[PDB]
Design a protein around this nucleic acid. Structure first.
Lengths: 166, 205, 129, 240, 58, 123
RNA sequence: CGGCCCCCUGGACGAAGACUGACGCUCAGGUGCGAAAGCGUGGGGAGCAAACAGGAUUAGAUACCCUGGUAGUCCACGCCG
RNA sequence: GUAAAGCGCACGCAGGCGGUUUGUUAAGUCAGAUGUGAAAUCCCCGGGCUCAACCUGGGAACUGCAUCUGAUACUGGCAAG
């Protein structure tokens, strides 16, 4: 269904896992939940929360929901250089234009999420729901173009077709 | 100021011997350390962003034979003479008189080495300099005060050390009880687990 | 009445791309013309013409030669009401240098690069995003 | 290649049958009503159709196999006429939207059909009791109807031919994910999707749709015959 | 025996039972049903699990 | 809204960084105990928990929890108080400093001695 | 704002002839303005109806459901709209 | 919109804002010109007392101010469209 960036070989960064219930006679819930962010170890889009009858299916649901069945805004190369704010399904991440590479600091499990996402180069504060199941959206709302490549000639990139169109 | 006390405990998390208590008991062998220490070890531990920062500050406190409090002044000097902060801080950590003393061999442990500083057995420029935090630069000379050139324990430590604790950035002579420190190293020569730019991002915000 | 015709200029380009056009025509200021030239040489618009009825009027051609790719929105920051002025040294490259400010200097309208190399300040008109 | 333009006019002269209401997103290719019946602009569709029918020709040397999707209770007979081969595959009446990503299941039911079709056809379907044997005949029927447009297809198709964009939103998603391009024929009261190439057109009554699909198929189908005959001639030259 | 052995030594029971089934049907079972119970997860109260695959008619 | 609009209409603001009440702009303050209450709290989780009202020496009166460990407080004793709300207990904006004055904890110690109390038993 | 119309008159909606030419936009302050009942004084009260009476309902019945029945509902202008 | 939060509504002066063109001006705009901005403990570059803490010479954002000269690309003033 939903198409994503390039990768070669994938890392199943499971950041969190949980269990749901509402057990009763006839129709019931008894499954497990799992949360994974999928990437290549530098920068890729993809985030999936899924659930199933047991722990093996729970994780396979989650890895499918990252890679398909999910709306994302795209990335190019494993680095950011279009730092801007945004909103996707209430979740707000703000990034002011500053240095690339160095300055990276974010608490709890989030510094590890940012390394597979490609936006550990430029980053600033989060607002809206502050839970690690929904704020991993960094490379989506915090990137409002479909490519943000590492050559600074990116701002001449669309220009070279526009003045040839003149 | 030499901390010690509950000394081995911090190595027992760390999996490096931290240079404290070497010999025949640096990482395991007669040392009982991470060979199921205690009466527990079945449960899953948890980490955070502050957990890897804390672990890496713990590493760097003991490997240079310093403290958190010593390392705060080392940063107050690192910013004042400006560059890349993490680079500057290590130059100063590795620039301690206790670390020149340690790498030359004159004590084969952090506690030994710093003791020979403090207890006036170490001289810089032929005058006794009893401060481990004394700054030492390339082609400077360390030498031993007279009433301490009779140490049996000095002679013993240099030979335990012989071409297994002695680095190539220095020279020493085990007969004259004196040496020239020829070059201050950086992280490319040393161990590459410790990181001091990440620790300044923590203390700045 | 609308107070700002230059917010309208931008809204014309945005909605222009969204409605899958290739051209957008409007009533023109002297200021509008002076703006459209910096955009055209900076390659965020493709072309324009200037033509008369009862006053001067600007017709322009979109970045729908290639659609959307780095710029998805263009907005003016020194408008009617809120104005902000920038000195010769603090003229910015918006989005960590993946962009420009269009800058009205006391020499005329040019981009932030050229105003800064000349060491000329002024009123900061519009950014790409 | 004026030949594409003949077929578009020859099909297009049913002038619609549906009311003066149309899909807003199709508006460019729609001419004004005559007494509450929708009429497509016939001239404005003839430039599109020639661009489409050359693109179908280029993929004939890439082609694996074709899959006619968007089938339903009125569009099937029009797909029947289009295929003229088993180099190109189809179903008659209905289609289950999506096969491209749950291929795992789909190949597992093809193996259940052909095993139990061979038992039925030998006369050796009868085991345990007669109740059980009839119960298996009843599942053989069920498979055949579920499978008819894939039960002969060698894997996954190199292009996808969709007449109905309207129940096929899930198939188009999955096909693109498998890295297959869609070639589409969309109605004037249907919404166009995320597809790679379109024929703008009006699919009212059986007389228009059999020809649009037939024109689409000729370019690609006889391309395919000629690329394969060439593979014979590139090897046989050596031996002559 | 093999699925209690994992649980006795607190290694696994979420997938230990599924490899039992895999290993069973490859030598000749048209189907196997498994139920695991105990004090599973180190919990101060009792839990259950189950898994059926292929056919087990009664 | 406009930016101009907001100069003409001032914003409503609160402090997002302080909410626990505190007297004389400091972390500790002294008062004499007046009363003790055995009380049952907010939430379906219930104990007969022990709290004091204390009369401060700076002219206010507050109710504080006896924290740390045990109940060892007298009903009229000058004791040291610390800001810190102990949630579901009635009117509790404060806790009592177990290592100061008349307060002391119960049974040995492996915890603090600032709160939980008792002189040195171990390192 | 509800039968429909006229008399007075506001406001909208189209279109040709013709006319002025930013006379624009927004709006602290501001004056002006009622769905309903309430309401000051006047007209009106056929039916319905709060209360009050009494039934019926029910682990009780102020709620539920009923009957009588007064103010009210109905008009005109006015008062913080 | 519904989470706390659109004035109950019109009309509109004061303040804020100003389609499009010319003339004219220059409040804010920016550039230019020049003076001021002690002192380290802060900051940047040096230095010394066993390093350090500590203290410090030179430079400084001195996070602060000053007015003339020049400009009309911008908005504001005023005149006729």
């Amino acid at each position: 269904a939903h198409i994503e960036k390039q990768a070669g070989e994938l890392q199943e960064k499971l950041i969190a896992v949980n269990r749901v219930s509402k057990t009763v006679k006839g129709g019931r819930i008894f499954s497990f939940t799992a949360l994974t962010v999928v990437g290549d170890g530098n920068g890729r889009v993809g985030f999936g929360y899924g659930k199933a009858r047991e722990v093996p299916a729970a994780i396979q649901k989650a890895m499918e929901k990252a890679r398909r069945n999910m709306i994302n805004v795209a990335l190019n190369n494993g680095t950011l250089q279009h730092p801007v704010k945004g909103v996707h399904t209430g979740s707000r991440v703000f990034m002011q234009p500053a240095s690339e590479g160095t300055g990276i600091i974010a608490g709890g499990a989030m510094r590890a999420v940012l390394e597979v996402a490609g936006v550990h180069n430029v980053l600033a504060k989060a607002y809206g729901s502050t839970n690690p199941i929904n704020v991993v959206r960094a490379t989506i709302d915090g990137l409002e173009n479909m490519n943000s490549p590492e050559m600074v000639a990116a701002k001449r990139g669309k220009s070279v077709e526009e003045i040839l169109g003149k | 100021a030499r901390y010690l006390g509950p000394k081995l405990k911090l190595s027992r998390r760390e999996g490096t011997d931290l240079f404290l208590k070497s010999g025949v008991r640096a990482i395991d062998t007669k040392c009982k350390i991470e060979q199921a220490p205690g009466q527990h070890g079945a449960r899953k531990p948890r980490l955070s962003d502050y957990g890897v920062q804390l672990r890496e500050k713990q590493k760097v406190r003991r490997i240079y034979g310093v403290l958190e409090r010593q390392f705060r002044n080392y940063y107050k000097e690192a910013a004042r003479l400006k560059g890349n902060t993490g680079e500057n801080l290590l130059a100063l950590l590795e620039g301690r008189l206790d670390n020149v003393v340690y790498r030359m061999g004159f004590g084969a442990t952090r506690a030994e080495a710093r003791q020979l500083v403090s207890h006036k057995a170490i001289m810089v420029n032929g005058r006794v300099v009893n401060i481990a935090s004394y700054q030492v630069s390339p082609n400077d000379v360390v030498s031993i005060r007279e009433k301490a050139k009779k140490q049996s324990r000095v002679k013993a430590a240099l030979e335990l050390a012989e071409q297994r604790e002695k680095p190539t950035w220095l020279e020493v002579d085990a007969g004259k009880m004196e040496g020239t420190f020829k070059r201050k190293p950086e992280r490319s020569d040393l161990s590459a687990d410790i990181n001091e730019h990440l620790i300044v991002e923590l203390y700045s915000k | 009445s609308m107070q700002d015709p230059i917010a309208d200029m931008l809204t014309r380009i945005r909605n222009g791309q969204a409605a899958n056009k290739a051209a957008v025509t409007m009533p023109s200021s002297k200021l509008k013309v002076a703006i459209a030239n910096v955009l055209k040489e900076e390659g965020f618009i493709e072309d324009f013409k200037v033509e008369g009825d009862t006053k001067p009027e600007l017709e322009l051609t979109l970045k729908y030669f290639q659609g959307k790719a780095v710029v998805e929105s263009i907005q003016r920051v020194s408008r009617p009401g809120l104005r902000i002025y920038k000195r010769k040294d603090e003229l910015p490259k918006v989005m960590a240098g993946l962009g420009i400010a269009v800058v009205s200097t006391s020499k005329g309208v040019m981009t932030d690069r050229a105003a800064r190399q000349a060491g000329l300040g002024g009123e900061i008109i519009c950014y790409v995003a | 290649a004026t030949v594409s333009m003949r077929d578009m006019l020859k099909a297009g002269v049913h002038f619609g049958h549906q009311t003066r209401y149309w899909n807003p997103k199709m508006k460019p290719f729609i001419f004004g009503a005559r007494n509450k019946v929708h009429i497509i602009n016939l001239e404005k569709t003839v430039p599109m159709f020639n661009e489409a029918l050359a693109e179908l020709n280029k993929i004939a040397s890439r082609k694996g196999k074709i899959l006619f999707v968007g089938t339903k209770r009125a569009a099937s007979e029009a797909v029947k006429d289009a295929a003229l081969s088993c180099d190109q595959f189809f179903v008659n009446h209905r289609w289950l939207g999506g096969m491209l990503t749950n291929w795992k299941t789909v190949r597992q039911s093809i193996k259940r059909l052909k095993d139990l079709e061979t038992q039925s056809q030998d006369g050796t379907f009868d085991k345990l009791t007669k109740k059980e044997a009839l119960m298996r005949t009843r599942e053989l029927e069920k498979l055949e109807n579920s499978l008819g447009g894939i039960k002969d297809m060698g894997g996954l198709p190199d292009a996808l031919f969709v007449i109905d964009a309207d129940h096929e939103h899930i198939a188009i998603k999955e096909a693109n994910n498998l890295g297959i391009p869609v070639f589409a024929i969309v109605d004037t009261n249907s919404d166009p999707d995320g597809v790679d190439f379109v024929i703008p057109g009006n699919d009212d009554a059986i007389r228009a749709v059999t020809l649009y699909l037939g024109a689409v198929a000729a370019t690609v189908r006889e391309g395919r015959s000629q690329d394969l005959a060439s593979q014979a001639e590139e090897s046989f030259v050596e031996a002559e | 025996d093999s699925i209690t052995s994992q649980l006795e030594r607190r290694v696994m029971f979420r997938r230990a039972m599924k490899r039992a089934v895999q290993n069973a049907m490859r030598l000749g079972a048209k189907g196997i049903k498994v139920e695991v119970s105990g004090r599973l997860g180190g919990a101060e109260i009792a839990r259950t699990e189950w898994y059926r695959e292929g056919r087990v008619p009664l | 809204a406009t930016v101009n609009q907001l100069v003409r209409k001032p914003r409503a603001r609160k402090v997002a960084k302080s909410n626990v009440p505190a007297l004389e702009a400091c972390p500790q303050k002294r008062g004499v105990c007046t009363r003790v209450y055995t009380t049952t709290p907010k939430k379906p989780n219930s104990a007969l928990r022990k709290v004091c009202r204390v009369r401060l020496t700076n002219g206010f009166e507050v109710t504080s929890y006896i924290g740390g460990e045990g109940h060892n407080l007298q009903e009229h004793s000058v004791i040291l108080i610390r800001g810190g709300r102990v949630k579901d207990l009635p009117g509790v904006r404060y806790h009592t400093v177990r290592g100061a004055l008349d307060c002391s904890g119960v049974k040995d110690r492996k915890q603090a001695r600032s709160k939980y109390g008792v002189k040195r038993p171990k390192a």
